[PDB]
Design a protein around this ligand. Structure first.
Ligand code: HEM
Ligand SMILES: [K+]
Length: 248
C-alpha cells in the first residue's frame, strides 16, 4: 500500500545527478559494502507498531552512530558529507537510501527501484533494534518480522547482502569476508553458506541459523541454485526495507 509523495522537478533532477555522482564516488572509494550497511542500519530501526525509526536521516546523528551495532558507520557518514553538500535540496534520508541502492548497482547487483520524498526526522530511535549476530531464527523473526514488518522471504534475501563486504575485529569483533569476491554482488553468500567453512571466509551464527530453519533453508537452497531468483527477491526486499514507514 505505497503512495509516493510529489517532489518538485528540481528535487528529481538532483536525485538523478546525485545517483550518477554516487556511482563514481562509491566505485572509486571501494566503499559499496559500507554504504549498503549504512542504508540498512538507517532503515532497520523501524518499528511498525509505533511507526518509529526507519530511513529518516537520523543515522547521521552522533547519538545513533554511537550505538554498538553501528560501530564503524561514522566512517560512511564522513565519506558522504562532501558529496551530500553538493545536493542541498535532497533530504539526508533520501541521500543515504540512494547510496545504498547505488552500492548494490555498482557492484553488479539488481537495480532496486527508488522513490524520493523521505523527510528527515529530528529524533533517533532508541538503541537495540538492530539484529544480534550471535542469535538465531527466533531473533531474526522478532527483528525483521515483529518490528520491521518484513516477510521470511525478505529476511533470507536481505541477508544475501553479505555477498559484499566483510567483518572487522575492531568494529563488530568478527573478522573476514563472507565470500571470495567481496566487491561483486552475486549469490555466493548462499553458495558458501551451503558448502561449509572455507579457510579465509567467515559466517556469523545468525547466517548459519538460516540453514536449520524449515522456512529459511528452502530459500537458501533456491538462491544458491538460481542467482536470477535471488536478484529478484533481493530487489523486492531492499525496496521494502528502504521504504519502511515511508509513503505508508
Ligand atoms: C539480519 C541479521 C544481520 C546481522 C546479525 C548482521 C551483522 C553484521 C555484522 C556483525 C557485520 C560486521 C560489521 C563489521 O565488523 O565491520 C556486518 C557487515 C555487513 N552487513 Fe550485515 N547483518 C545483518 C543483516 C544485513 C542486511 C539485511 C544487510 C543489507 C541488505 C547487511 C549488509 C552488510 C554489509 C554490506 C556488511 C559489510 C560492511 C563492510 O564491509 O564494511 N547485513 N553485518
Ligand atoms: K560476492
Amino acid at each position: 500500500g505505497k503512495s509516493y509523495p510529489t517532489v518538485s522537478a528540481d528535487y528529481q533532477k538532483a536525485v538523478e545527478k546525485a545517483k550518477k555522482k554516487l556511482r563514481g564516488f562509491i566505485a572509486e572509494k571501494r566503499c559499496a559494502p559500507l554504504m549498503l550497511r549504512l542504508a540498512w542500519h538507517s532503515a532497520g530501526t523501524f518499528d511498525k507498531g509505533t511507526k518509529t525509526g526507519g530511513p529518516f536521516g537520523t543515522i547521521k546523528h552522533p547519538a545513533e552512530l554511537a550505538h554498538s551495532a553501528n560501530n564503524g558507520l561514522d566512517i560512511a557518514v564522513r565519506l558522504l558529507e562532501p558529496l551530500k553538500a553538493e545536493f542541498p535540496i535532497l533530504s539526508y534520508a533520501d541521500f543515504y537510501q540512494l547510496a545504498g541502492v547505488v552500492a548494490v548497482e555498482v557492484t553488479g547487483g539488481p537495480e532496486v527501484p527508488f522513490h524520493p520524498g523521505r523527510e528527515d526526522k529530528p529524533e533517533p530511535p532508541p538503541e537495540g533494534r538492530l539484529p544480534d549476530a550471535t542469535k538465531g531464527s527466533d531473533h531474526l523473526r522478532d527483528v525483521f518480522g515483529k518490528a520491521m514488518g518484513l516477510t521470511d522471504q525478505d529476511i533470507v534475501a536481505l541477508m544475501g547482502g553479505h555477498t559484499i563486504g566483510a567483518a572487522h575485529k575492531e568494529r563488530s569483533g568478527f573478522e573476514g569476508p563472507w565470500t571470495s569476491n567481496p566487491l561483486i554482488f552475486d549469490n555466493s553468500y548462499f553458495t558458501e553458506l551451503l558448502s561449509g567453512e572455507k579457510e579465509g571466509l567467515m559466517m556469523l551464527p545468525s547466517d548459519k541459523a538460516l540453514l536449520s530453519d524449515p522456512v529459511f533453508r528452502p530459500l537458501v537452497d533456491k538462491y544458491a541454485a538460481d542467482e536470477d531468483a535471488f536478484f529478484a527477491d533481493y530487489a523486492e526486499a531492499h525496496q521494502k526495507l528502504s521504504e519502511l514507514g515511508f509513503a505508508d
